[PDB]
Design a protein around this ligand. Sequence first.
Ligand SMILES: [Zn+2]
Ligand SMILES: [Zn+2]
Lengths: 324, 324
Amino acid sequence: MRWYPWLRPDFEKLVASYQAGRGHHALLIQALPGMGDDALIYALSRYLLCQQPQGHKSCGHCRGCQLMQAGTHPDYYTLAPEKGKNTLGVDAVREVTEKLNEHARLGGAKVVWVTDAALLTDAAANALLKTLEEPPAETWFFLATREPERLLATLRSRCRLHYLAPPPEQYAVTWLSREVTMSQDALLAALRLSAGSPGAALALFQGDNWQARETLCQALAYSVPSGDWYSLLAALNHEQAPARLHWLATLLMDALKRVTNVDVPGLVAELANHLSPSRLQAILGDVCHIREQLMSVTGINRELLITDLLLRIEHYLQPGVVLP
Amino acid sequence: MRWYPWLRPDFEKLVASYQAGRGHHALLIQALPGMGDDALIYALSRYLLCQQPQGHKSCGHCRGCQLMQAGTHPDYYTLAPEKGKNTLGVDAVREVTEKLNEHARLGGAKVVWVTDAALLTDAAANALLKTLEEPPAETWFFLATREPERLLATLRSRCRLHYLAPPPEQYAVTWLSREVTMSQDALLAALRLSAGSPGAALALFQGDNWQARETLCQALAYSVPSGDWYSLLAALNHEQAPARLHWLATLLMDALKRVTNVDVPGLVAELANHLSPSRLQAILGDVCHIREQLMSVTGINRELLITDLLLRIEHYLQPGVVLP
Ligand SMILES: [Zn+2]
Ligand SMILES: [Zn+2]
């Protein structure tokens, strides 16, 4: 968790509303990963659970802050998928909502943080909704998501959406330049690959990721002129395949614009030069569809999905083939 | 970690010294567990690594604070026994000291926190010493211990000792009364058992501990009149035997005062009534000696140590036995 400098505008805007009573019991924060919704929700949680706030800040001394620092505040709740699963069950939710019906142990506010409302199960989201439609006194809910479209529809309409928008690109590049030492086109590229999220753009430079993209890039440099796309399996067959497929989709889409990958105009050119627009699009549609298949229910056998993808792509390159 | 209210006096005293340049590069903090030396050392670490301190506080916005919040500051070091061991090896130390010889990544201060200087190995402490005798520029070390007597002697003389003294008993009882709901003699007892450490006194009320003492207490109520001391094995044979032996020692010592266990004057009386002072002392000396044996090198077979202890005790109760 980190307090990024672009969070202030949003923080002061939301915090003031809770302070002046214009706060919603259900705040749905929309944000890309690495934008700091977690730090924002925490700073707001800390403010509300501060028994003696100093302006918009938590004091860091009162007992409430002491129990928060310790991680033992009885009135603060966290709903995250049990480390054993990848979704959020109904028992966990109800278990927290049931307790939300008792008078707050420290006699003040109660705060509930749903880490990713998308992971909620259909019965869990349905149970949360019931609580949201009849909010227990002095309870403040914070639900965060990357894509609110992936949420139980009825849940979305009971929350006030606050979109945590990325800061200006130029500001983000500079921030990044301070976190790592790289050519600025690579930074801007990482940033565009991340949809403007500076934290996620920084995660790419930390470890496996940046090198993985180069390997992919090197692998594409061979597949394009050779027509051998199945050879890409190594660079894509890995846990983080969904992100790796995004990179790919991103290059194809750049090749179709006669720009996200500003650091590799060479390969974008090679793609736009050797592949017809009809094929760049057919390949792009397929890549995006498999990307989703891998994220919706990572087909128990991911390598099959990908190999078939690479073979459909090679089928596309053939003269006389109908592209659909 | 928790910012206890009794820490302020010490915090402001130390922080002011670093601010006015009267700070020692090697601060050895002496404190009982649960006194908050960890929170104190952290607040001081945070102050020194704040690139834009506001008085004595860290700002919580500058990049240094951001990396600390994230737990990624390259100039902050932590030396704790690797989770796989119960001591602190030489490789870990040197590994940090070697890096302490490079110019600080963020160009400011460097902070090293030795969690428990007692756990240092003889070669590790000896290596730390070498660094302490020739402190690298702008580096601040914080070593904490429960008993400075258990440290490499040469290490102790290169550090400024700051004893984090427990707050007044009356203040500690009241603080505790706010953390738990118990009869105040039990609080004061827990507190005295903890040597005045309010955090450690609170840990006794959290789980296994308080019930474990009652079980021990109930077990003593039977052993005293029956002379059957081996029957205490169940109540004492457990991971936390050293603390459990302390409780015992504490009751014997109270029985010898013709008061730490203020909540159970009944059992203290029964002890002082049925056991002669010569035996209370012989039993007390043995208990304390086994306690240490269990903490110095928890005799691979702890249950043997304890059973022999209980049998020596029964031997003591016999008419005509020389007590030594
Ligand atoms: Zn507070
Ligand atoms: Zn700062």
